[PDB]
Design an enzyme around this catalytic site. Sequence first.
Site, PDB file in Angstrom:
ATOM      1  N   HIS A 109       1.146  -1.804  -0.099  1.00  0.00           N
ATOM      2  CA  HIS A 109      -0.147   0.189  -0.016  1.00  0.00           C
ATOM      3  C   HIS A 109       0.964   1.345  -0.453  1.00  0.00           C
ATOM      4  O   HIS A 109       0.226   2.303  -1.122  1.00  0.00           O
ATOM      5  CB  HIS A 109      -0.996  -0.272   0.705  1.00  0.00           C
ATOM      6  CG  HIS A 109      -1.995  -1.543   1.421  1.00  0.00           C
ATOM      7  ND1 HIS A 109      -1.918  -2.606   2.219  1.00  0.00           N
ATOM      8  CD2 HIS A 109      -2.631  -1.439   0.550  1.00  0.00           C
ATOM      9  CE1 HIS A 109      -2.133  -3.444   1.604  1.00  0.00           C
ATOM     10  NE2 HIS A 109      -2.973  -2.769   0.723  1.00  0.00           N
ATOM     11  N   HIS A 130       4.871   7.311   6.498  1.00  0.00           N
ATOM     12  CA  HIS A 130       5.276   6.751   5.641  1.00  0.00           C
ATOM     13  C   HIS A 130       4.846   7.926   5.191  1.00  0.00           C
ATOM     14  O   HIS A 130       4.106   8.703   5.016  1.00  0.00           O
ATOM     15  CB  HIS A 130       4.025   5.360   5.370  1.00  0.00           C
ATOM     16  CG  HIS A 130       3.021   5.624   5.836  1.00  0.00           C
ATOM     17  ND1 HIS A 130       3.121   5.295   7.106  1.00  0.00           N
ATOM     18  CD2 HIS A 130       1.883   6.420   5.275  1.00  0.00           C
ATOM     19  CE1 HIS A 130       1.708   6.012   7.521  1.00  0.00           C
ATOM     20  NE2 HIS A 130       0.752   6.423   6.550  1.00  0.00           N
ATOM     21  N   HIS A 163       1.622   9.162   1.234  1.00  0.00           N
ATOM     22  CA  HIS A 163       1.143   9.121   0.260  1.00  0.00           C
ATOM     23  C   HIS A 163       0.970   9.996  -0.482  1.00  0.00           C
ATOM     24  O   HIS A 163       1.435  11.120  -0.911  1.00  0.00           O
ATOM     25  CB  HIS A 163      -0.730   9.367   0.697  1.00  0.00           C
ATOM     26  CG  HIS A 163      -1.117   8.887   1.847  1.00  0.00           C
ATOM     27  ND1 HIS A 163      -1.354   7.431   2.312  1.00  0.00           N
ATOM     28  CD2 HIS A 163      -0.569   8.497   3.270  1.00  0.00           C
ATOM     29  CE1 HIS A 163      -1.727   6.767   3.102  1.00  0.00           C
ATOM     30  NE2 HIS A 163      -0.856   8.052   4.307  1.00  0.00           N
ATOM     31  N   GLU A 197      -3.563  13.537   1.547  1.00  0.00           N
ATOM     32  CA  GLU A 197      -4.854  13.107   2.217  1.00  0.00           C
ATOM     33  C   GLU A 197      -5.398  14.320   2.561  1.00  0.00           C
ATOM     34  O   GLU A 197      -7.125  14.645   2.192  1.00  0.00           O
ATOM     35  CB  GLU A 197      -5.117  11.714   3.259  1.00  0.00           C
ATOM     36  CG  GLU A 197      -3.702  10.470   2.318  1.00  0.00           C
ATOM     37  CD  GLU A 197      -3.979   9.617   3.289  1.00  0.00           C
ATOM     38  OE1 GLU A 197      -3.829   9.284   4.335  1.00  0.00           O
ATOM     39  OE2 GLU A 197      -4.553   8.517   2.581  1.00  0.00           O
ATOM     40  N   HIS A 213       3.212  11.199   6.908  1.00  0.00           N
ATOM     41  CA  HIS A 213       2.625  10.676   7.927  1.00  0.00           C
ATOM     42  C   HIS A 213       3.673   9.864   9.161  1.00  0.00           C
ATOM     43  O   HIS A 213       4.471   8.981   8.717  1.00  0.00           O
ATOM     44  CB  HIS A 213       1.499   9.650   7.852  1.00  0.00           C
ATOM     45  CG  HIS A 213       0.814  10.181   6.925  1.00  0.00           C
ATOM     46  ND1 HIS A 213      -0.488   9.622   6.533  1.00  0.00           N
ATOM     47  CD2 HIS A 213       0.104  11.689   6.767  1.00  0.00           C
ATOM     48  CE1 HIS A 213      -1.232  10.312   6.198  1.00  0.00           C
ATOM     49  NE2 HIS A 213      -1.188  11.948   6.425  1.00  0.00           N
ATOM     50  N   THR A 238      -6.494   6.560   8.034  1.00  0.00           N
ATOM     51  CA  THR A 238      -6.756   6.450   6.714  1.00  0.00           C
ATOM     52  C   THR A 238      -6.740   5.579   6.336  1.00  0.00           C
ATOM     53  O   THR A 238      -6.856   5.391   5.058  1.00  0.00           O
ATOM     54  CB  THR A 238      -6.319   7.618   6.193  1.00  0.00           C
ATOM     55  OG1 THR A 238      -4.932   7.221   6.279  1.00  0.00           O
ATOM     56  CG2 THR A 238      -5.842   8.872   7.216  1.00  0.00           C
ATOM     57  N   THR A 239      -6.258   4.366   6.701  1.00  0.00           N
ATOM     58  CA  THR A 239      -5.835   3.003   6.091  1.00  0.00           C
ATOM     59  C   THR A 239      -7.318   1.836   6.253  1.00  0.00           C
ATOM     60  O   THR A 239      -7.114   2.522   8.020  1.00  0.00           O
ATOM     61  CB  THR A 239      -5.223   2.446   5.413  1.00  0.00           C
ATOM     62  OG1 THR A 239      -3.993   2.526   6.279  1.00  0.00           O
ATOM     63  CG2 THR A 239      -4.181   3.567   4.175  1.00  0.00           C
TER      64      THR A 239
HETATM   65  C1  LIG Z   1      -2.853  -2.922  15.101  1.00  0.00           C
HETATM   66  C2  LIG Z   1      -3.351  -2.334  14.031  1.00  0.00           C
HETATM   67  C3  LIG Z   1      -2.912  -2.580  12.812  1.00  0.00           C
HETATM   68  C4  LIG Z   1      -3.609  -1.620  11.498  1.00  0.00           C
HETATM   69  C5  LIG Z   1      -2.350  -1.059  10.518  1.00  0.00           C
HETATM   70  N1  LIG Z   1      -2.297  -0.116  10.084  1.00  0.00           N
HETATM   71  C6  LIG Z   1      -1.339   0.560  10.747  1.00  0.00           C
HETATM   72  O1  LIG Z   1      -0.890   1.216  11.999  1.00  0.00           O
HETATM   73  C7  LIG Z   1      -1.723   2.090  10.100  1.00  0.00           C
HETATM   74  C8  LIG Z   1      -0.855   3.855  11.074  1.00  0.00           C
HETATM   75  C9  LIG Z   1      -1.080   4.588  10.516  1.00  0.00           C
HETATM   76  C10 LIG Z   1      -2.106   5.407   9.512  1.00  0.00           C
HETATM   77  S1  LIG Z   1      -2.379   6.626   8.728  1.00  0.00           S
HETATM   78  N2  LIG Z   1      -2.317   6.966   6.748  1.00  0.00           N
HETATM   79  O2  LIG Z   1      -3.623   7.419   9.428  1.00  0.00           O
HETATM   80  O3  LIG Z   1      -1.421   7.379   8.965  1.00  0.00           O
HETATM   81  C11 LIG Z   1      -2.806   4.432   8.911  1.00  0.00           C
HETATM   82  C12 LIG Z   1      -2.574   3.015   9.467  1.00  0.00           C
HETATM   83 ZN   LIG Z   2      -0.440   7.573   6.448  1.00  0.00          ZN
END
Ligand SMILES: CCCCCNC(=O)c1ccc(S(N)(=O)=O)cc1
Ligand SMILES: [Zn+2]
Length: 258
Positions: free
Chosen positions: A62, A92, A94, A104, A117, A196-197
């Site tokens: 992603h 990371h 986007h 975003e 982010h 946001t994912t």
């Molecule tokens: C333990 C739960 C697993 C979640 C895996 N997803 C993440 O750790 C995650 C981190 C930051 C952002 S964001 N794009 O909003 O910065 C989105 C997702």
């Molecule tokens: Zn992000």
Amino acid sequence: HHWGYGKHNGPEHWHKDFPIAKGERQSPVDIDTHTAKYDPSLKPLSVSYDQATSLRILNNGHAFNVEFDDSQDKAVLKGGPLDGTYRLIQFHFHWGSLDGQGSEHTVDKKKYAAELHLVHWNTKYGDFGKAVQQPDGLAVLGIFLKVGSAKPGLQKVVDVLDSIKTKGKSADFTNFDPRGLLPESLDYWTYPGSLTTPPLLECVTWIVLKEPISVSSEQVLKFRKLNFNGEGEPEELMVDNWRPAQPLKNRQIKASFK
Ligand SMILES: CCCCCNC(=O)c1ccc(S(N)(=O)=O)cc1
Ligand SMILES: [Zn+2]
């Protein structure tokens, strides 16, 4: 498994597996600069990254994550709208297929070429998996990228991308200093929101810096050569991995600056 950013699995589809996609505190949002109110009670952010220990860079299908050692209190974010101590775990970006889209968050409907982010979790919850289940469990510092002059502190990241082209590839990425990704000013907007994912958890205090950083066309071109697919699969360029702005609903965005 199996969400993504295509026509058939993109943001408009996510709600079927992640019903919180239509929740009350989703991210990103449009920041209306004329409606965000200056809050003189907000503090200066404290970004303490002197002891940051980067470890690895991973293409996760992603985006790519630069991962940090978050086993103790090395790189932390404190102050601003936050209570307590938030440990940096990864960053990371986007980004878009073209310079006119990719971020975003938007600012008065303006989309930037990309958005960084820096993800941090509240150490009062002990681990990251516990922190994401809490309304105040994460703080994500968001930084806009515009195309112009190169960002010297980004070059080490762009130079390793060739080695993690496809999903599941990782590479050693030690001694990277995330301080080289910051703009000069720490003026920010803040509001309560979500990952946001997927799983789109409503666990994030968003802190979005007003000042973008500038990166060169060559730098962002190198992001766009990454692949969403695994090795040997049909090539799908990793571009447009951004979620559009979501309804603000019952939330106020606060400004740190007058
Ligand atoms: C333990 C739960 C697993 C979640 C895996 N997803 C993440 O750790 C995650 C981190 C930051 C952002 S964001 N794009 O909003 O910065 C989105 C997702
Ligand atoms: Zn992000």
